[PDB]
């Protein structure tokens, strides 16, 4: 009976996702980021009479909120040291030890792309309907952290520590989520852990100095 | 879900519950139908060969070690039916099960949209209002002076009245009100 | 300023001379018009502050508070209309008189250019809130709540009076602009430290710290809906406004004297958000959320950064609007069920769809959502605090996580889930209370659209 | 090859030893608990599908839970050295810890700025 | 015990006035209060006030400061002056204490 | 579109179908009012297996207490009807 | 185009001429031609009508230059009139310097986007101007509080001049 | 008194008019430095009494 | 069985056996079906922790 | 593909294997949801109540 | 056939509130939006000019939009 509300929610998620993708400054990036999170909460808790669905939506909010903490740390550092929040001045700050912003962006990407440590919301969060599972947690929403890192790749290339820990984190989460996907019975759970494994593979590709291959795998996946 | 549990489960009930749970977990392990039938026949043979004991303590010890074995080698992710607790689509349509007293709060325009239904609903409300007093009188007359009272309810004893406390389960929402 | 004060003063004869069948209509309509009149001092073309009179003055800081007060008076009338329907006409007119006097005194307090007049109107506002809470509260504990509120405020405010008379005897004027221009540095003595404490602790009581804050949940639980509205949306901001005003004459020693209150604010916002997590009462949850947001405001004003002041003003206005909205929604459920227990009404999204929409928007405003002045204020407070010390980001992050958790916990446990079908007395909705939610939420959208108004003194 | 429970992931009713070594006293206790449950269920059902009911059901158990959680704690609080120590540490230890954290950080920052080893690269608005 | 009125039940307000708007018991005062709240609260203060705030010009000298900054930057660029001199006040009109 | 509704006759036919394919009983002796132990000669394990087969046939789980209450194909049919809200 | 290249510099675009070595038609060129003929022409006509109406009802607005009042340095302390005028002109200059900083930041962002991959090389003068204006802003307005004032700015400048004079002794 | 009855609707508008009058009276009360500030201090124009009323 | 007078203000409130609501019988229909608790039953002190939206204490296979 | 096809034919084979901790670890998601989602909410909520509110 | 009555809450009061709110908001804003569009199309948008010959402009003569100039002339 709420098919119109369902379609409107999907449209709102698409609008927020395209805002997040095409945003030029980190504030608009954050608008798209958190709008994607909120529409994810609603679409996971679509059947609001289901307690398990409500728990899944709440824990997705929790893990994405820890990612938001990392995002806010990066945003605040960039505001304090480059008074624009815009990617052009972010480019102009490419060689001044961006360890704190890159660590914050890595935490944000871990939260959104469900790497190890902040992973289980992605497999838990498809007790909602299957088109929600598909569009949200298989093609667009979970890409967002990897998209953030490929957006900040020119800063990323000058920090070897961030590249190494991205490679290690991505390898760990792709191995662990493939292991979890091996002995699973729910089809949605199998494809969710497969999605997490491919996101870990994109994180590995970002651990190398190849962001463009990671974005190619984003579209392909 | 329709019968209230007693004070305790008898030994026969506990054995039957263990048998059903063991067969379900056995199916979850051996997915394939022929393999499941083979091992289910083996499990039935084990229950049959421990069936006749004539010693309550020995039977209880057998049941205890069988439950120990079940918890030792149960399936960590067993098969759960949909519309069953723990499975997918368990409480899915609770968001659509509207509890039917909101029709009292419906506007006269909305009631005018469905005239025959609301005439039948008014007839049902009149029947409930007329039957409530005899329901209460029968429940008071039910012989429960002190002590052992179970959660069961009596039927309509005399001719012409209704079973007590019938409304909340006769007029419950449909399992898929879509 | 008189063109705003005098119509609000004439609201009282209108209230007492209107017919009993036209009192609410007349007072609500004319208070809406008074808010529209109070919109006229946003005409700030020059950087000069609008000094209308020798005793009344305007400000980019005072103006949003005045407009919020004048906007909130008709909202309080609408909210308090239903729970006074079985009441004497004299009592109804007296309640409306209390609300109108609160609006008049708060407008005069925010527009006052003298600290001693600010103090006088501060306690003048202390009176009718006490009368409202005690006379029209529901439970027994309203008398204890009134005692706690009144004497927390008074024990705070007496050293403020001593400090103000000390400053007047020292510099001769006690006028805000003269003090701002010929402010004098303090020679960092123990007497000056006690002077700083005396002039700060009144406002640190009025907007809650982690210490003295115990009056706020009691008063908010025991107060009626208009009392909760006026408290949580104006009076804490009145304390913050006083701190911003009086901090200018304490230049050299705030930078070390503000240390314990910054720590108190940060750890207290964490602890009060935790209480919101394990809180069984909806009004208590909203009250402790107010404590957390005002702790953020305290920390920003103490660190005294232009980003901190701007974020403090934005969080002041945003929190006033969203806390009043949350209180009104909770009051709608309480008027349905006559109990404030949170776990008791659960599946309300089924029967109240657009009220659930207002709940969802109010909670998305309660947590920091980036297209909102709530996130604007919280984010710039975070930026200023991280500039103050880089390690504050840990406390900020913990607070943000727990804030999202209690807001979404509120939504899930009071709107979603299986409906408690035994609650027959769930009337569909009042157009009045849906209008009340809309009149809370639409100004949030408009101020998000143009946040230059809510930016305070510093930029 | 044995299940070890804990406060989280407790012991099943199919594994606890009390289920198998039953006594007539425990059977009588179970029957009495069933009787209490049945009486409360009957009272609730009468109050629930009474047609003359125009309001909700008040739930005195929930009222007692709320009152015990809210307005009973200070009347039934007794100061002991244990809770005095707990209150002192929980109300002061975090404050002193974050005091020393922020104080050391700000003193280091101020010293670096005064000695010129810290440069604000493009920090114009703070 | 004392001679007290019992707790009154709360009536279904829609049982007698199905077009109830939340304001008053009798329908005429109720509908006129609804109309007064909507007209004075949405029509003339959420629209006219929004328009007035929108057409307040040069709010705290923002557009003036834009034009003045453009003029000063253009002047200092075409005249070769150091744009944004480091010292605000002229050093010749400031007297420093000796030694 | 999908999921055709089930009626009392279909429920009775499917229950009788499964019981006729039990192969332990019913040599053209089964009726709809035949008790599993009184005049079909079964026991509790057989009744549990019959309930399991009915659950696998209809795709939903009968809870244990109601399941052990069920003892005849007529009341199995009545239980499916009460759970699925048949004869709307 | 109210903006001028003196305050918002933009190098002249150098686009290369097409060399269609393939035989396939260009859908971009076809869509741009159709887009012009369908969208751009009616929009241009509407804007020309609107501009004709504006030229009929043409009116003017001015700039309001302020003249220099006596500053905080040349009048006595405790005189609230001179202090008020100096404070107002200092706040005016502060807002003007904020927008000067905004102009330089816009210029830097435009340089970075225009040059793209060569921003580390040919944006040298934009980055140099940004660094110099940042240094001057930090010298005049940085450490002032949320109650920043002409008196506080003067005190900061006098302290900085004292430190520079003391360093110039040795 | 031709309309009568609901006469109370002029109370708040009367208060608003009186408040505007009191603001005008305060503007007439201050009146110092009419053109004596260092910022504006312009000539009085061939046809103009005061700069602002 | 009340709390052992261990400081904080537990009065005569009972010590319920400290198990989450996930471990209640889910087939049995409860008066508070989301809470899995009947009307008039004593509420656990930590019902907020032990609701099905929150901390689970159900037995695990490992 | 070949290894998994061989293992699936081994599942076709009619014999019960002994359950291994590697398989239990994989099917219970590495125990990360159970362990973390039971120890972090319990400690956080219990600390929040039993200190922040009631102490 | 076999259409069943789905039980729904009373959405009439919700729809009535939304209809009334949109009605009043439209009832004033649509004339205001039309007036804004007509003013911007036909008049206004003052063009920046230099100060001529020592002329002293009016204060509203420093503002751009015609509605801003009208309010500044008639009220401030
Ligand atoms: C001289 C040499 C020997 C000294 C010695 O042996 O000291 C032992 C003595 C502890 O004695 P004990 O063996 O625990 O006493 C148990 C009773 O005999 C038996 O217990 P009882 O149950 O019979 O007694 C009831 C209750 C009697 O009731 C009470 O004690 C009431 C509570 C008193 C205050 C408790 C403070 C701690 C809680 C703070 C909570 C948070 C606050 C906000 C943040 O007793 C207690 O609670 C025992 C602890 C009493 C502590 C008294 C502290 C006095 C100095 C306080 C200084 C200021 C503190 C901060 C104030 C901040 C204000 C903003 O002190 C210490 O070990 C450390 C303190 C040393 C001095 C400082
Ligand atoms: C609600 C909060 C309550 C606690 C915090 C209250 C402030 C704590 C710190 C300030 C001291 C106490 C208040 C003094 C008010 C006047 C301050 C002032 O003018 O200082 C400058 C003056 C000094 O004057 P001076 O600065 O002109 O000194 C001359 C200096 N030379 C010569 C250099 C020019 O301080 C005092 O005179 C302080 C005397 C205080 C005597 C009374 C103390 C009463 C008990 C203290 C607590 C009272 C509140 C709590 C009561 C209990 C509540 C449960
Ligand atoms: C090689 C490199 C390796 C690097 C490794 C790095 C690891 C970093 C890990 C950081 C995060 C750890 C903590 C995560 C906690 C998440 C808790 C959660 O979401 O629990 C969900 C759970 C319900 O879910 P569940 O029970 O599974 O589902 C039932 C359905 N059958 O329960 C609930 O929903 C309960 C409701 C919430 C209760 C309140 C929770 C408040 C939490 C406040 C936390 C504050 C501190 C945060 C610190 C973050 C640090 C990054
Ligand atoms: C000041 C103190 C206030 C205290 C509380 C007061 C409460 C009572 C308020 C009474 C009325 C006062 C209204 C105040 C806000 C006015 C908004 C407004 O019109 O702003 C002007 C703005 C255009 O002005 P402009 O100068 O361009 O803006 C700055 C650009 N440099 O205009 C616009 O941009 C047009 C705005 C209206 C058009 C509709 C906008 C729709 C926006 C949809 C947003 C959707 C997403 C929302 C997400 C929310 C998430 C929580
Ligand atoms: C609640 C937590 C309270 C304790 C927090 C941790 C200790 C904070 C101490 C402090 O405020 O230190 C600042 C300052 C440091 O010393 P200094 O700057 O040299 O000042 C000499 C004073 N004549 O020390 C001082 O200025 C000494 C006086 C501090 C008074 C603090 C405020 C009163 C207590 C409020 C509670
Ligand atoms: C300023 C405020 C100062 C408050 C001082 C309070 C001192 C209390 C000392 C004391 O007796 O602590 C007892 C406490 C627990 O001991 P007990 O009460 O026997 O409880 C048994 C269960 N732990 O003992 C402990 O908790 C041991 C702590 C060891 C470190
Ligand atoms: C039907 C209900 C009402 C519908 C109203 C519809 C239009 C709403 C327009 C809203 C415009 C934006 C809101 C803010 C306007 C503020 C105007 C104001 O007070 O300006 C101050 C000014 C002071 O006078 P001043 O201009 O100094 O006089 C010397 C000449 N330069 O004052 C003036 O110049 C004179 C005052 C002009 C505005 C009067 C507003 C009065 C509102 C309160 C009384 C309403 C009574 C009911 C309606 C009566 C209708 C006849
Ligand atoms: C996953 C795999 C799980 C493996 C579980 C393996 C458990 C199998 C072990 C057994 O069968 S031991 C069974 C012990 N039970 C008894 O001794 C019960 C005997 N007592 C009786 O009264 C019995 O006659 C009955 C069967 C309970 C009576 O029922 P009738 O059919 O009415």
C-alpha span between C268 and C299 (Å, rounded)? 11
Solving technique for this entry? cryo-EM
What H or E segment, with its residue span, contains residue K47? strand K47-48
- Length in residues, chain E: 99
In terms of Cβ atoms closer than 10 Å to its own Cβ (0-12, 13-18, 19+), residue G3 is exposed
Q: Which two tokens stand for residue C364?
A: 């998305």
Chain B adjacent subunits, 3+ CB pairs under 8 A: A, C, D, E, F, I, J, K
Are E57 and K43 contacting, i.e. CB atoms less than 8 angstroms apart?
no
E46 half-sphere exposure, CB direction, 13 A CA radius: 25
Q: Which helix (H) or strand (E) holds C31?
A: helix C23-38
Q: Which residue has the tokens 């049945």?
A: D38
Q: In angstroms, rounded to a whole number, what is the distance separating the alpha carbons of residues A84 and A80?
A: 9
Q: I19, J25, B5: which is closest to D16 by C-alpha?
A: I19
Is C185 in contact with C177 (CB distance < 8 Å)? Answer: no
Using the structure block, give the residue that is written with the tokens 């009071």: C414
**Helix H segments across chain B?**
11-29, 33-49, 56-72, 108-113, 115-141, 167-170
CA D67–ligand 6 middle distance (angstroms): 29
Q: How many CA atoms, within 13 angstroms, populate the side-chain half-sphere of residue K1?
A: 2
Q: How many helices (H) and strands (E) does chain C have?
A: 20, 0
CB H15 within 8 A of CB C6: yes
CA B159 to chain centre: 28
Task: Tell me how far apart the alpha carbons of residues H34 and C46 are, in angstroms, rounded to a whole number.
Answer: 18
| Terminal CA-CA length for chain H | 35
Q: Are B43 and B23 in contact (CB under 8 A)?
A: yes
Give the separation between CA G151 and CA F43, rounded to whole angstroms: 100
What tokens does F1 get? 């579109």
Whether residue G6 contacts residue E77, with contact meaning beta carbons closer than 8 Å, is answered with yes
Q: Taking the alpha carbons of C294, C298, C301, C306 in that order, is the dihedral positive or negative?
A: negative
**Interface contact C343-I53, CB threshold 8 A:** no
Classify each residue of F26-51 as buried b or exposed e, where b means 16 or more C-beta atoms within 10 Å of its C-beta.
Answer: eeeebeeebebeeebebebbbbbbbb
Q: Strands, E, within chain D: which ranges?
A: none
Look up tokens 């707790």; give the residue: E7
- Domain ranges across chain H: 1-51
CA B28, CA G97: separation in Å to the nearest integer?
Answer: 74
CB < 8 Å to K48, chain G? 2, 60-63
Q: What is the tally of helices (H) and strands (E) in chain E?
A: 3, 0
Environment class of J4 (CB within 10 Å of its CB; exposed 0-12, middle 13-18, buried 19+): exposed
Determine whether the interchain pair A50/B97 forms a contact, defined as Cβ–Cβ distance below 8 Å. no
Cα A141 to Cα A137: distance, rounded to the nearest angstrom: 6
Does an interface of 3+ CB pairs under 8 Å exist between K and I? no
**Coil/strand/helix, residue C25:** helix
Burial environment of residue A57 by CB neighbours within 10 A (0 to 12, 13 to 18, 19 or more): buried
Residues 6 or more apart whose Cβ sits within 8 Å of residue G138: D120, D123, D124
Question: Can you say whether the dihedral through the CA atoms of D72, D75, D80, D84 is positive or negative?
Answer: positive
> Which residue, among B92, H20, C230, has the nearest Cα to A47 in the 3D structure?
B92
**C-beta separation of K41 from E28 below 8 A:** no
Give the closest-approach CA distance of C340 to chain D in angstroms. Answer: 10
Those residues with Cβ within 8 angstroms of residue G20's Cβ, 6 or more apart along the chain or in another chain: G26
List CB contacts of B117: < 8 A, sequence separation 6 or more. Answer: K5
**Which residues 31-50 on chain J approach chain B with CB closer than 8 angstroms?**
none
Q: Say if CB A196 and CB A173 are below 8 A apart.
A: yes
Q: What are phi and psi of C341, to 5 degrees?
A: -70, 130
**Stretch (H or E) spanning G60:** strand G60-61
What is the maximum alpha-carbon separation in chain J? 62
- Please tell me the distance from the alpha carbon of residue G160 to that of residue G148, in angstroms, as a whole number: 17
Helix orientation angle between C2-17 and C89-111, rounded to the nearest 10 degrees: 170
Residue of chain D nearest J35, judged by CA positions = D8
Q: How far is CA E86 from CA A47, G15, G158, in A?
A: 63, 41, 13
Atom in ligand 6 nearest the alpha carbon of residue D86 = 26
Nearest by CB to residue I55, choosing from J31, J45, J55, is J45
Cα separation, C93 vs C77, in Å, equals 11
Positive or negative torsion for Cα J18, J23, J27, J29: positive
Cα→Cα distances G98→E65, G137, G140, K63, Å? 8, 9, 12, 21
The residues pairing with D78 across neighbouring beta strands, listed in sequence order, are: none
Instruction: Spell out the SS3 assignment of chain I.
Output: CECCCCCCCCCCCECCCCCCHHHCCCCCCCCECCCCECCCCCCCCCHHHHCCCCCCCCCCCC
* Residue in chain D lying closest to C337 (CA): D56
- Closest residue in F to K5 (Cα–Cα): F88
Distance D82 CA to ligand 6 centre (A): 4
| C204 burial via Cβ count (<10 Å: 0-12, 13-18, 19+) | buried
Provide the 8-state DSSP code for C190.
H
Distance CA D86, CA I6 (A): 12
Question: Nearest to residue C432, comparing CAs of C225, C274, C279, C261?
Answer: C225
As given in the structure block, the two tokens for residue B120 are 């039948």
φ and ψ at A217, to 5 degrees? -70, -25
Q: Chain J interface, mutation test: which of A121, A183, A197, most J Cβ atoms within 10 Å?
A: A183
Query: Minimal CA–CA distance to C305: which of C386, C240, C198?
Result: C386
Q: Which residues pair with I14 in a beta bridge?
A: I2
Whole-number Å distance between alpha carbons of J34 and J30: 9
Half-sphere exposure of F23 (CA within 13 A, CB side): 1
| Distance separating alpha carbons of residues C30 and G57, to the nearest angstrom | 39
Bridge partners (DSSP) listed for residue A86: A25
Nearest to C401 by CA among C269, C302, C295, C243: C269
Per-domain boundaries in chain C: 2-459
Note whether F77 and F54 are within 8 A (CB).
no
What are the structural domain ranges in chain F?
3-88
How many angstroms does the Cα of residue K29 sit away from the middle of ligand 4?
Answer: 14
Three-state SS for C281? strand
Interatomic CA distance for residues A153 and A163, integer angstroms: 10
Give Cα E48 to chain centroid, integer Å. Answer: 13
* Residues of F assigned a catalytic role: 43
Subunits that touch chain D (at least 3 Cβ pairs < 8 angstroms)? A, B, C, E, G, I, J
How far apart, in whole angstroms, are the C-alpha atoms of residue C224 and residue C232?
12
CA distances from C382 to A111, B25, C15, G49 (A): 20, 53, 45, 50
CA–CA separation, A73 and K20 (whole Å): 45
Q: Which two tokens stand for residue B26?
A: 């056995």
Tokens describing residue D45: 């059902």
B19 alpha-carbon distance from chain centroid: 19
Distance CA C109, CA B85 (A): 60
Exposure string of C12-29, with b = 16+ CB inside 10 Å and e = fewer, is bebbeebeeebbbbbbbb
Distance CA C27, CA C18 (A): 9
The subunits that touch chain E, with at least 3 C-beta pairs less than 8 Å apart, are: B, C, D, G, K
Quick one: resolution in A? Answer: 3.0
Residue E12's CB is within 10 A of a number of other CB atoms, namely 14
Percent of residues in chain H assigned helix, strand, coil, to nearest 5: 45, 0, 55
Return the SS3 of E14: helix
Taking the C-alpha atoms of residue C154 and residue C152, their distance in angstroms, rounded to an integer, is: 6
Cα dist from C264 to A123, C243, C270, whole Å: 40, 16, 10
B27, B42, C300, F49, J15 from B34: Cα distances, Å: 10, 13, 72, 16, 11
| Residue of F3, F85, F86, F88 for testing the chain K interface, max K β-carbons within 10 Å | F88
Residues C107 and C230 sit within 8 Å (Cβ to Cβ) = no
Query: Is J55 close to D90, i.e. CB distance below 8 A?
Result: yes
- Per-state percent for chain D, helix, strand, coil, to nearest 5: 60, 0, 40
- A45·C400 Cβ contact <8 A: no
How many angstroms from the chain centroid is the CA of residue C354?
26
Q: How far apart are CA C233 and CA C247, in angstroms?
A: 22
**Which residues, including other chains, have CB under 8 Å from residue K15's CB and lie 6 or more apart?**
none
**Residues in H lying within 8 Å of C, measured between beta carbons:** 6, 8-9, 11-16, 18-20, 22-23, 26, 30
Beta G60-61 vs K47-48: how paired, if at all? parallel
Please tell me the distance from the alpha carbon of residue B119 to that of residue B106, in angstroms, as a whole number.
14
Q: Angle at Cα C288 formed by Cα C287 and Cα C290, nearest 5°?
A: 65
Q: Give me the residues paired with residue J3 across strands.
A: none
Inter-chain CB proximity I34 and A54 less than 8 Å: no
Check chain B for breaks (C–N over 2.5 Å) and list the residue before each, or none. Answer: none
The encoded tokens of residue A166 equal 């991205």
Q: Is the CB of E41 under 6 A from ligand 4?
A: no
| D78: nearest Cα among J54, I9, I3 | I9
Residue C315 CB contacts under 8 Å (≥ 6 apart), including other chains: C293, C296, C297, C300, C374, C377, C378, C381
Assigned token pair, I53 = 């939206």
Neighboring chain C residues of A73 at a CB cutoff of 8 Å = 386, 393, 397
Are residues B98 and C349 in contact, defined by beta-carbon separation less than 8 angstroms? no
DSSP lists the bridge partners of residue C112 as C56
Closest CA to J30 of A55, A173, B31, B88: A173
Compute φ and ψ for E84, nearest 5 degrees.
60, 70
As a dihedral over the C-alpha atoms of residue E11, residue E12, residue E15, residue E18, rounded to 10 degrees, the angle is 130
> H-type helices in C207-258, by residue range?
215-222, 225-230, 236-246, 254-257
- What ligand 4 atom has the least distance to the C-alpha of E59? 26
Q: Which residues contact C84 (CB under 8 A, 6 or more apart)?
A: C91, C92, C95, C136
Residues contacting residue G117 through CB under 8 Å, at least 6 positions apart? none
Cα C236 to middle of ligand 5, angstroms:
25
**Which residues, listed in sequence order, are joined to residue A87 by a DSSP beta bridge?**
none
How far off is chain E from K2, nearest CA to CA, in Å? 32
Distance of residue A89 Cα from the nearest chain G Cα, in angstroms:
7
**Cβ–Cβ of G80/C304 closer than 8 Å?**
no
Distance C154 CA to ligand 5 centre (A): 24
Among D7, D11, D77, the residue with its CB nearest the CB of I9 is D77
SS3 C341: strand
């Amino acid at each position: 009976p709420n098919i119109n509300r369902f379609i409107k929610y999907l449209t709102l998620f698409l609008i927020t996702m395209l805002i997040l993708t095409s945003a030029n400054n980190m504030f608009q990036l954050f608008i798209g980021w958190e709008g994607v999170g909120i529409m994810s909460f609603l679409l996971i808790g679509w059947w609001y009479g289901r307690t398990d669905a409500n728990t899944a939506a709440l824990q997705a909010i929790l893990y994405n909120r820890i990612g938001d903490i990392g995002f806010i740390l990066a945003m605040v550092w960039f505001s304090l040291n480059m008074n624009s929040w815009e990617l052009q001045q972010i480019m102009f700050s490419n060689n001044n030890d961006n360890l704190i912003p890159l660590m914050g962006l890595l935490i944000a990407a871990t939260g959104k792309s469900a790497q190890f440590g902040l992973h289980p919301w992605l497999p838990s969060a498809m007790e909602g309907p299957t088109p929600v599972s598909a569009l949200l947690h298989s093609s667009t929403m979970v890409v967002a952290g990897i998209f953030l890192l490929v957006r900040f790749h020119p800063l990323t290339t000058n920090n070897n520590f961030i590249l190494t820990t991205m490679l290690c984190l991505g390898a760990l989460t792709t191995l662990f989520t493939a292991i979890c996907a091996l002995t699973q019975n729910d089809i949605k759970k199998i494809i969710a852990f497969s999605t997490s494994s491919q996101l870990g593979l994109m994180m590995v590709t970002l651990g190398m100095n190849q962001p463009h291959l990671a974005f190619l795998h984003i579209c392909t996946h | 879900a329709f019968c209230a549990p007693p004070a305790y489960l008898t030994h026969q009930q506990k054995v039957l519950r263990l048998y059903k749970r063991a067969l379900r977990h056995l199916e979850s392990w051996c997915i394939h139908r022929d393999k499941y039938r083979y091992f289910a026949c083996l499990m039935r043979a084990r229950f049959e060969e421990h069936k006749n004991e004539k010693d309550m303590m020995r039977a209880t010890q057998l049941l205890r070690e069988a439950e120990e074995e079940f918890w030792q080698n149960q399936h960590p992710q067993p098969y759960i039916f949909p519309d069953s607790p723990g499975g997918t689509s368990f409480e899915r349509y609770e968001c659509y099960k509207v509890p039917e007293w909101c029709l009292d709060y419906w506007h006269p325009s909305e009631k005018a949209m469905y005239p025959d239904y609301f005439s039948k609903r008014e007839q049902w409300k009149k029947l409930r209002m007329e039957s409530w007093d005899r329901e209460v009188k029968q429940l008071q007359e039910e012989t429960s002076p002190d002590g052992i009272m179970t959660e069961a309810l009596p039927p309509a004893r005399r001719e012409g009245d209704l079973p007590p406390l019938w409304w909340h389960i006769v007029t419950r929402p449909r399992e898929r009100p879509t | 300023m008189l063109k705003i004060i005098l119509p609000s003063l004439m609201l009282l004869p209108l209230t007492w001379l209107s017919s009993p069948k036209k009192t609410w209509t007349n007072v609500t309509s004319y208070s809406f018009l008074i808010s529209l009149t109070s919109l006229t001092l946003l005409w700030q073309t020059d950087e000069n502050y609008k000094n209308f009179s020798n005793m009344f003055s305007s400000d980019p800081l005072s103006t949003p508070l005045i407009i919020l007060t004048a906007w909130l008076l008709p909202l309080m009338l609408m909210a308090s209309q239903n729970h006074l329907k079985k009441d004497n006409n004299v009592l109804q007119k007296l309640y409306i008189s209390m609300l109108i006097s609160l609006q008049i005194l708060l407008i005069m307090t925010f527009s006052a250019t003298e600290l001693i007049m600010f103090y006088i109107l501060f306690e003048a506002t202390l009176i009718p809130t006490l009368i409202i809470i005690t006379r029209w509260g529901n439970q027994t504990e309203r008398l204890n709540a009134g005692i706690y509120f009144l004497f927390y405020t008074l024990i705070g405010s007496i050293p403020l009076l001593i400090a103000l008379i000390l400053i007047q005897n020292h510099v001769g004027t006690l006028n805000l602009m003269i003090l701002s221009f010929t402010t004098h540095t303090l020679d960092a003595s123990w007497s000056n430290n006690l002077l700083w404490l005396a002039c700060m602790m009144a406002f640190l009581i009025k907007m809650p710290l982690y210490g003295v804050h115990l009056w706020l949940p009691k008063a908010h639980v025991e107060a009626p809906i208009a009392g909760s509205m006026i408290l949580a949306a104006i009076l804490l901001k009145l304390g913050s406004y006083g701190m911003i005003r009086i901090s200018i004459i304490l230049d050299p020693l705030t930078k070390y004297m503000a240390y314990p209150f910054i720590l108190l604010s940060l750890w207290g916002m964490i602890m009060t958000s935790s209480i919101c997590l394990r809180q069984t009462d909806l009004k208590s949850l909203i009250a402790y959320s107010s404590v957390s947001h005002m702790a953020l405001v305290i920390a920003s004003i103490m660190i005294q950064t232009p980003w901190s002041f701007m974020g403090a003003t934005m969080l002041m206005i945003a929190h006033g609007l969203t806390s009043s909205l949350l209180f009104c929604l909770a009051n709608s459920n309480y008027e349905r069920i006559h109990s404030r227990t949170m776990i008791m009404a659960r599946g309300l999204q089924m029967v109240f769809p657009l009220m659930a929409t207002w709940w969802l928007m109010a909670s998305l405003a309660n947590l920091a959502l980036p297209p909102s002045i709530n996130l604007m204020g919280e984010l710039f407070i975070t930026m200023s605090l991280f500039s103050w010390s880089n390690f504050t980001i840990i406390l900020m992050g913990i607070n943000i996580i727990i804030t999202g958790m209690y807001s979404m916990y509120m939504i899930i446990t009071t709107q979603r889930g299986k409906l408690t079908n035994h609650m027959i007395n769930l009337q569909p909705s009042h157009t009045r209370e849906l209008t009340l939610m809309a009149l809370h939420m639409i100004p949030l959208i408009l101020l998000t659209t143009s946040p230059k108004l809510i930016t305070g003194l510093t930029m | 090859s044995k299940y070890k429970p804990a406060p989280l992931a407790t012991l099943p009713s199919t594994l606890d030893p009390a289920e198998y070594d039953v006594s007539p006293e425990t059977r009588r206790a179970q029957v009495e608990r069933l009787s209490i449950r049945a009486r409360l269920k009957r009272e609730y059902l009468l109050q629930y599908n009474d047609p003359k009911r125009v309001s909700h059901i008040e739930d005195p158990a929930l009222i007692r839970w709320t009152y015990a959680r809210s307005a009973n704690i200070y009347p039934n609080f007794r100061p002991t050295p244990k809770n005095s120590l707990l209150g002192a540490v929980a109300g002061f230890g975090p404050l002193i810890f974050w005091y020393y954290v922020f104080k050391t950080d700000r003193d280091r920052k101020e010293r670096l700025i005064q000695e010129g080893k810290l440069d604000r690269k493009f920090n114009i608005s703070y | 015990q004392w001679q007290e009125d019992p707790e009154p039940e709360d009536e279904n307000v829609y049982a007698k006035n199905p077009d109830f708007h939340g304001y008053d018991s009798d329908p005429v005062v109720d509908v006129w209060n609804m109309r007064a709240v909507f007209f004075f609260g949405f029509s003339i203060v959420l629209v006219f006030g929004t328009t007035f705030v929108a057409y307040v010009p040069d709010y705290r000298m923002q557009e003036w400061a834009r034009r003045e900054a453009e003029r000063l930057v253009k002047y200092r660029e075409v005249n070769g002056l150091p744009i944004m001199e480091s010292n605000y006040f002229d050093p010749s009109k400031i007297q420093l204490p000796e030694d | 579109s999908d999921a055709p509704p089930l009626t009392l006759d279909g429920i009775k036919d499917r229950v009788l179908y499964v019981l006729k394919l039990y192969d332990k009983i019913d040599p053209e002796k089964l009726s709809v009012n035949s008790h599993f132990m009184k005049d079909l000669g079964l026991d509790s394990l057989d009744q549990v297996e019959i309930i399991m087969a009915m659950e696998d046939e209809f795709g939903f789980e009968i809870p244990d207490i109601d399941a052990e209450k069920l003892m005849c194909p007529q009341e199995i049919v009545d239980y499916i009807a009460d759970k699925k809200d048949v004869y709307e | 185009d109210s903006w001028d290249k003196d305050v918002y510099p933009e190098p002249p675009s150098r686009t290369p001429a097409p060399s269609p070595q393939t035989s396939l038609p260009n859908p971009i060129t076809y869509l741009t031609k159709a887009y012009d003929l369908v969208v751009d022409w009616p929009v241009t006509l509407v804007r020309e009508f609107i501009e004709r109406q504006h030229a009929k009802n043409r009116t003017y607005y001015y700039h309001r230059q302020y003249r220099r009042v006596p500053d905080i340095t040349e009048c006595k302390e405790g005189d609230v009139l001179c202090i008020y005028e100096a404070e107002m002109q200092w706040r005016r200059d502060f807002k003007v310097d904020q927008e000067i900083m905004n102009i330089i930041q816009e210029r830097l962002k435009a340089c970075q986007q225009r040059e793209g991959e060569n921003y580390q090389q040919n944006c040298a003068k934009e980055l140099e101007q940004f660094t110099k204006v940042t240094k001057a802003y930090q010298d005049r307005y940085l450490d002032l509080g949320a109650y920043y004032s002409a008196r506080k700015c003067l005190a900061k400048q006098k302290q900085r001049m004292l430190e520079e004079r003391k360093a110039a002794r040795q | 008194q031709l309309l009568r009855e609901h006469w109370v609707h002029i109370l708040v508008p009367a208060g608003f008019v009186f408040g505007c009058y009191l603001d005008r009276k305060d503007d007439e009360k201050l009146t110092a430095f009419r053109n004596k500030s260092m910022l504006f201090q312009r000539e009085l124009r061939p046809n103009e009494e005061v700069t602002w009323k | 069985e009340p709390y052992p007078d261990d400081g904080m203000g537990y009065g005569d409130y009972p010590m319920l056996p400290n198990r989450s609501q996930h471990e209640r019988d889910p087939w049995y229909q409860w008066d508070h079906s989301e809470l899995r608790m009947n009307w008039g039953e004593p509420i656990h002190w930590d019902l907020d922790m032990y609701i099905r939206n929150r901390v689970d204490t159900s037995p695990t296979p490992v | 593909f070949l290894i998994a096809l061989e293992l699936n034919n081994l599942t076709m084979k009619l014999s019960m294997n002994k359950a291994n901790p590697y398989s239990s670890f994989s099917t219970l998601l590495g125990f990360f949801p159970s362990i973390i989602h039971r120890i972090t909410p319990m400690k956080s909520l219990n600390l929040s109540l039993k200190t922040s509110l009631t102490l | 056939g076999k259409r069943l009555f789905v039980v729904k809450p009373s959405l009439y009061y919700d729809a009535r509130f939304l209809r009334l709110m949109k009605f009043y908001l439209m009832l004033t804003g649509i004339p205001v939006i039309i007036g804004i569009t007509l003013v911007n199309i036909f008049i206004g948008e003052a063009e920046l000019a230099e100060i001529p010959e020592g002329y002293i402009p009016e204060h509203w003569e420093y503002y751009k939009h015609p509605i801003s100039r009208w309010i500044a002339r008639n009220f401030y």
